[PDB]
Every structure is written in structure tokens, then in C-alpha cells.
């Protein structure tokens, strides 16, 4: 595990970063990456939401033992997933997500890079992003394991949390290591 690591026990937990109102960013492109370790079949690791109203959202979850991502910036829901490799083997794994409007990218450990290039006409901007939620509890699929070096468009949310950031709020069965 790379640097700051957080442990999610039974009963789940949730680290939430709430962007200060006049600072909820919009983005055409997105760089999301995190290193985990878990023995679950289903669970949501990270989820970014656009202030209530606007629909847009980004989700990093594990469906049937395979890490994947689902998001929506305005058209339909676009998903991309590493269905070959398996990652719920309790061992260390790192996933990297990339978005450029609708077109997206995913990559686990060292497996080949996956590319999703959505259908017809696609929308581009992830409007007014207001919260990053780690723990996938609120979405009803608690996570149990360890997360490290979480990087989202420049934010190393996990350190921020560790360094008691005025905006990060930890609640639940989460512990620092």
C-alpha cells in the first residue's frame, strides 16, 4: 500500500470531501486512480456527485469481483470495466480511470488499457462537482478493506482526510493506518 492507508471494517464507513460551494469544479476530463485490497464480490469504493439537481456523477465499484467504473455527464450512463482480471483476492491492486467527455479509459495493475468510446452524440461536462464519497456506504454497498493513495483530478483526498482537512468528514468504521 502506497502511503496513507485507511481500513474499513464491518459496519462499513465513509470519508466524504465536500467542496466549498463557490468551488465545485466542472470538468471535461478526469483522472481518477486508487489502490485497494478487498475480498468482496460487490462494493462501491469511490463516488463523486454533482450538487443536487444536476445529474452527473462518477462511480468506481467492484461488480462480481471485477473492478469497473460507471459515470454520466449528461447523456446516458457510460460504463467501462476490467472483466478479465480479478481483484477481490484480498491482495493489493491499483486501478486508473480516465475520462474525456464521453470517451473513457480504465486500467488495472498492468493489464492492457481498456478503452470505451460511447455511441452516438455525447455530452462532455461533469457540472458542479460537490462531493467525493469513499466507502460506498450511502450508495448501499459498503466497502470493507483497505484504500490508499486516492487521486482525483489533483486531490489526494486520503491525505487530506488524514491531515484533518476542514472539508473532509470521516464517519463510520473507518480507521487510519
Amino acid at each position: 500500500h502506497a502511503g496513507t492507508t485507511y481500513i474499513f471494517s464491518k459496519g462499513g464507513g465513509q470519508i466524504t470531501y465536500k467542496w466549498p460551494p463557490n468551488d465545485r469544479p466542472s470538468t471535461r476530463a478526469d483522472r481518477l486512480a486508487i489502490g485497494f485490497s478487498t475480498v468482496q464480490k460487490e462494493a462501491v469504493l469511490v463516488r463523486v456527485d454533482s450538487s443536487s439537481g444536476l445529474g452527473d456523477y462518477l462511480e468506481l465499484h467492484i461488480h462480481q469481483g471485477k473492478i469497473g467504473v460507471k459515470f454520466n455527464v449528461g447523456t446516458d450512463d457510460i460504463a467501462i470495466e476490467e472483466s478479465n482480471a480479478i481483484i477481490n483476492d484480498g491482495k493489493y491492486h491499483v486501478v486508473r480511470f480516465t475520462r474525456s467527455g464521453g470517451n473513457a479509459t480504465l486500467q488495472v495493475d498492468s493489464w492492457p488499457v481498456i478503452e470505451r468510446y460511447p455511441a452516438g452524440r455525447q455530452l462532455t461536462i461533469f457540472n458542479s462537482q460537490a462531493t467525493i464519497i469513499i466507502g460506498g456506504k450511502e450508495q448501499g454497498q459498503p466497502f470493507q478493506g483497505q484504500l490508499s493513495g486516492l487521486y482525483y483530478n489533483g486531490l489526494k483526498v486520503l491525505n487530506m482526510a488524514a491531515e484533518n482537512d476542514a472539508n473532509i468528514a470521516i464517519v463510520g468504521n473507518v480507521r487510519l493506518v
Partner: protein, 533 residues
Amino acid sequence: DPLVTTNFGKIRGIKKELNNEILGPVIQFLGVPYAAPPTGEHRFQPPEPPSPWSDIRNATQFAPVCPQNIIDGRLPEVMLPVWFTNNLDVVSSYVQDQSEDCLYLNIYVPTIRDSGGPKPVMVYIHGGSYMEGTGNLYDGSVLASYGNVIVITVNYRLGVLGFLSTGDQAAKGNYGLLDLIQALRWTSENIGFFGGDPLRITVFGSGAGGSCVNLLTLSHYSEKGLFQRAIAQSGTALSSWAVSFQPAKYARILATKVGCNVSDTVELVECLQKKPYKELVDQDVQPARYHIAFGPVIDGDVIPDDPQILMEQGEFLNYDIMLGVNQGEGLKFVENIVDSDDGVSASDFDFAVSNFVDNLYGVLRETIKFMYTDWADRHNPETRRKTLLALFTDHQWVAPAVATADLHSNFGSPTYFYAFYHHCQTDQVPAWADAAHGDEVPYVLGIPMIGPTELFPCNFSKNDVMLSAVVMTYWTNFAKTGDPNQPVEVAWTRYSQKDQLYLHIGLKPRVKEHYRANKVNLWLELVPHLHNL
């Protein structure tokens, strides 16, 4: 001696004094090249980075302006600001020196016992109708000085040269828009060397200019971080004359006029790529009233889709937005037929509308007429005029403005909206007139603080200079923090769609809510629902 090294070479700027004993001095760097000359094979081509020099470049006087022709009244009276029309003389003595190689920008830097650290940067995108102008007209020294910010007036390809498209691949227009972005790239990288802060660049403009400002925020070519704030004064991406939707039609008509209407686009482009720049710029392509012949075009790349849609889909990044309108924008619209007794004949009114409708919407007619008649005085010709002018003003400026503010806010962007009710009283503008299109420019540039100028003749009162300061302090504070109230009786509250608080800028600034809520709704709400059956 004022010297500064850039990533392209060193340059010398001439220092200047201001006509006031409160305004410090300013170092002007006029004529700075921010891109490769759009000439020969580069005409109708995305701008290129500029070529470097070793020595020291003399940047002490305006470089040639872009190809235009304003003299012979072919200019759309209504679209251009009043000060520009009511003084074509002085204006001509600016754009008299032309050249196809015109991509240059001017930098105004202030000189210091008040603020330490990099100074904010305000880039002014000038604009008339996309066919003429030059940031050389707007001298941002008093602003630069009085505010403690660096001001940059820019020059970009206009007319045919800047926006001609063939509808297809031959020419994808939006050249002047790309020029404006190239200016911003140059700025974001080198304004640092002048003491500027590339993390606080605010692009602002008036009329056609503010339209660019807005279009700029809709293009993906303005990537995150380029510029942080925007001020669109009396101008949007939503107005009828902000975009050209028949770029081919008017391209071929320009082709036909200089002998080139070949059946193949690519040949037609090459054909024009030859003609003397002055031969193309002197033709006479006429657009439907209240529309543009040459200008920004929905190319699918720079301008991805119809501005109006992008706006509704939130297809823009988040910036600090400030925009507004003036009380009597469309002065020129009615000034046309206001009899000696300052009135409007009911038949001229009944006509003006029927006509306005024919051009903007080819029954609503009777609904418009109703909505714009003060029945509690259905016969006063002076009133009949005020409302007839509001018609244009509301539709062409106020409605689109609010439309923008409503969406920009609903999507996270911190927005501030203003209404301008105060102009300089001269003899060129009738007495019954009010703040017309562009009457805010001289107050945003701090002209009053340096007394009448060849450009702005008006004999500024003590109020004008006072109000000029009130305005500048907002604009700059905004450019400084993204809040017209920080840092330097009325707090300009934020604009939200639910309360629509706007600052009524006049001699009695004060926050009101829902500017012209009624008409604004007739245009964004009722008229559509109807033309929807």
C-alpha cells in the same frame, strides 16, 4: 527604461502619465505580437505561435489594426455602440492604418506602496459586429492604474478574414475566435514576466465582444485553467447576431462578388486565399436584418453545438461570471423614427413591430403589441416610444442576458448580474434617451477620471467621475477575487435563478430582484410556447 524578457524575446514599453493627480503612472507595451501573421497560406487558418527575436523589440506604438471599412455607413447602426457611431471621425483615425498581419495585443502595467504579489489580469475583448474595431480604441490605463491590475486590449482577425466558412471542410471559420484563444495562451504563459498572475485572468468585453467572451467559455479549446473569470457587458452567445448560421450562403456571395463562386469549396477558398486582402474587405455582403453575415459559426469543434443548447446542457466549465445590460440598449432601433416632438406615431409603432416580427420570426405580433403598450396612457407618443425601445432592448439584450445568468448559476458558476442606468449627457445623444448600447464602456475604462477625450467628448460631471470609480472598483475587485465586493452601503449580492438579485448601477446603486421579470418571461417563456403550435 522599461524592459521585460518574454519567452519570445525582450521588449521595451513606453511609460505614461495620467490626467489625474491620484492615478499613478503606467507602462504601456503597445504592439506586442502574440501570434504568427495570418498571411498568404496562413489566411483562413488557425493562428500560429509567434516567431522569436534575439535583440530588443520596440513595443512603443500600436501595431496595424485588422482589415476593415467603417466610413461608408454600411455598418449596422443598431449593433455598434453609440459612442462609436456618433463619432466615426475619431474612430476612423484609429483603424486608418491597416494590415493583414494584425494579430497583436496591448499590455498596460501599473507602477507601488499598496499591494505586493502578482497582479490580476483583465483581458478586454473588443467588439462591434465582428466586422470592425480595435482594442486600440479602449485605453485601459486609468483602469490598470486605479485598480492595480494589468489590462490587455487585444486585436483579432475580423470580417471575412476572421470568420468566413464554407459550411464544410474548405474553411471552418471561427478564425478570430481561435485568435482570441491564442492571445489567452500567450497571456497565460508570459503575463507572468510582467508581474501578472496567470491564475487570475478575467476576460471581459462589450457587445460583440462580450459575445466572444461567452462563446469562449463554450468552446472546448478553452481548457481548464486558461482564464478564471468572465464579464460580458451588453452581450451574449445567445443573441440573434452572435452567430452566423448561413456561413456558406454569405461565403459564396462574397465569392461571386470577387469572381470565385466555383462549384467546389476547396477551389473557392484558394481563389479567395489570393485576392488582395483589401479587395475582399471592400465587398458588400448584406445579412438579414438583426443578423450577421460573417462571424462565429457552429463548426462542431471550436463551437461544438448551438450556444443555446450547450448552455442548457451545462456544456461549459465553471468560471466567476459577471454580466448585465443597460436601460436603453436599443436606442438606435427607435431613434430612427422619433418625430420632432419626441414621439412615435402609433402607425410607426404598429409597423416597427410587424417588421421586427417578420425578421426574427418568419399573431405573436398582436401579443407583442399588447405587451408593449402602456394602456394607462395608450395615446402618449413619448411613452409609445419608451416602450417601443424597450421591445428591442428586452429582446436583443435583456432576455438573452438573463437567460445566460440563469443557466450559469444553475450550474455552479458564481454569477453577478447588473443593470446600468446612467449615461453621460452630451448633445449627440437626445435628452429623452437613456443608457444606450456601450454607454458603460467609458465608466469601465475610467475615462471620467481623465476628463473628456477625443474618443469620449462628453463633459463629465463630478458624478460621472464618482460613479466611474464605483464601477471600476467593482470590476477590479471582481478580477481580483471573483467577488465585486472584495477586497476594496451596497453589497452586490449574488445572482441565483431563484431570486435573481441584480445591482441597479446608477447614481443610487442598490440591489433589486428579478430585472424586468415580466418581459423577460414573455420572451423566454410565452413567445416560445406559442411559436410552438
